[PDB]
Amino acid sequence: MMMTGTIETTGNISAEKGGSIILQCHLSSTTAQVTQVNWEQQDQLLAICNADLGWHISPSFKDRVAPGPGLGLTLQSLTVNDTGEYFCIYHTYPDGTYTGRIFLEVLES
Numbered sequence: 001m002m003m004t005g006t007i008e009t010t011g012n013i014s015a016e017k018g019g020s021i022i023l024q025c026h027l028s029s030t031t032a033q034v035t036q037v038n039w040e041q042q043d044q045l046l047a048i049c050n051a052d053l054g055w056h057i058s059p060s061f062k063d064r065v066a067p068g069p070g071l072g073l074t075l076q077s078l079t080v081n082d083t084g085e086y087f088c089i090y091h092t093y094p095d096g097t098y099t100g101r102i103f104l105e106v107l108e109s
Contacts, residue, residue, distance in 0.1 A: 005030030007100035024072030025088035025100040032092035037071045040087045078106045
């Protein structure tokens, strides 16, 4: 029997400019305690949450990235430039780190 689990997501996204959308992950098939969540792109931290810090998001992203719902994020004022891979990284005890991936496509149409 598996002691560890898997990380599920809100799907790969097709969106239009100017819209808002929710990104979210969740653990499954493990009882591990989530101690931290990081939302990232390749070498960029968009948001972090843990008991000590609460939510922190860089002031450079404050108009684009909002915390929640839950351990997820809400992206605002989507642009074509937002297109790419987003990662939710969960630190957990005792299992360790799980990483989920969401691909976002933002279109002109």
